[PDB]
Design an enzyme around this catalytic site. Structure first.
Site, short mmCIF file in Angstrom:
data_model
loop_
_atom_site.label_atom_id
_atom_site.label_comp_id
_atom_site.label_asym_id
_atom_site.label_seq_id
_atom_site.Cartn_x
_atom_site.Cartn_y
_atom_site.Cartn_z
N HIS A 140 48.29 12.11 74.35
CA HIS A 140 48.57 11.57 75.73
C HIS A 140 49.40 10.11 75.66
O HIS A 140 50.43 9.89 76.21
CB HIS A 140 47.37 11.22 76.78
CG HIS A 140 46.61 10.08 76.30
ND1 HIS A 140 45.79 10.20 74.87
CD2 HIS A 140 45.90 8.95 76.93
CE1 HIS A 140 45.16 9.36 74.90
NE2 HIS A 140 45.17 8.70 75.99
N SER A 190 43.31 3.23 73.28
CA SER A 190 43.15 4.66 73.13
C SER A 190 43.48 4.81 71.38
O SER A 190 44.38 4.05 70.97
CB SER A 190 44.19 5.40 73.64
OG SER A 190 43.73 5.75 75.06
N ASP A 206 43.05 16.82 71.87
CA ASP A 206 43.58 15.64 72.39
C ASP A 206 44.23 14.63 71.24
O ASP A 206 43.85 13.60 71.41
CB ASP A 206 42.98 14.96 73.55
CG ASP A 206 44.00 14.34 74.48
OD1 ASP A 206 45.13 13.79 73.72
OD2 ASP A 206 43.69 14.05 75.69
#
Lengths: 52, 49, 151
Positions: free
Chosen positions: C28, C102, C50
């Site tokens: 992402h 992240s 992910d």
């Protein structure tokens, strides 16, 4: 005949469904209240259970 | 003609077996693909858990 | 340093990282890595985790954070402070971490990465992190609390 072979099966079906819901609640509630345990995977499967 | 044809009247056993084995092969082959896919999903759920 | 901020519009979107032989970065997060020697190595994505993985240059190779799947409950460090591992979850004191956090590694006391974060929820006085762990056999697995968000 239809009416009393359809009402009968409906009554029996609802009782059997309610009984199966109840037996599931009793199956899963103990594990539901122990966040940590090793579930019996056969019992985790046969009931709805999201195992560990 | 003293008869009426019926749209199966020429197929014959050999061409039937051909269509059979072909469709069956494709159906089994897709079933393989689906089986390996579901098996991977179940394997991963036990892989996490 | 041994983890690199990927950049977008100048403003680091996500720190990506270099674990055990492969640079990893979350899918992402969208950004140029900020290290030319990585900023172009093609990434092999895998959405089930992910993340995106890629081999580091053969010269870069001997800088690469170690890892291990054995993580007994206890204290582990983290850039933004300590993380705690209890009841098969990693938790962080409230309000620290968010958009930008992240993909930073979570290291143990011998310095090896045990996890790479992908998200969070603040839950009362703490925060559960959605993370990618190496399960008890060493297989990677994404562990996520409910409702967790992409950081």
């Amino acid at each position: 005949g239809l009416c009393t072979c359809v009402a009968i099966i409906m009554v029996s079906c609802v009782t059997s469904v309610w009984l199966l819901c109840r037996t599931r609640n009793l199956c899963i509630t103990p594990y539901k209240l122990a966040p940590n345990a090793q579930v019996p995977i056969l019992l985790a499967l046969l009931c709805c259970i999201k195992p560990t | 003609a003293q008869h009426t044809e019926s749209f199966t009247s020429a197929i014959s056993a050999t061409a039937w077996s051909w269509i059979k084995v072909l469709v069956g092969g494709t159906s089994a082959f897709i079933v393989l693909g689906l089986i390996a896919t579901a098996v991977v999903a179940l394997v991963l759920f036990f892989h996490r858990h | 340093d041994k983890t690199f901020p990927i950049m977008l519009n100048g403003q680091v979107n996500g720190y990506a990282c270099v674990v055990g032989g492969r640079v990893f970065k979350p899918l992402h997060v969208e950004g140029r890595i900020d290290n030319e020697q990585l900023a172009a190595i093609k990434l092999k994505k895998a959405s089930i985790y992910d993340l995106e993985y890629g081999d580091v240059p053969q010269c870069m190779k001997s800088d690469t954070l170690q890892y291990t799947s054995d993580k007994p409950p206890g204290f582990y460090n983290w850039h933004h402070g300590a993380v705690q591992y209890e009841n098969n979850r990693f938790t962080v004191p409230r309000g620290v971490g968010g958009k930008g956090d992240s993909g930073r590694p979570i290291l143990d006391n011998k310095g090896r990465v045990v996890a790479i974060v992908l998200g969070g929820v603040n839950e009362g006085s703490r925060t559960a992190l959605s993370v990618v762990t190496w399960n008890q056999k060493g297989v990677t697995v994404k562990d996520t609390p409910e409702g967790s968000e992409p950081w």
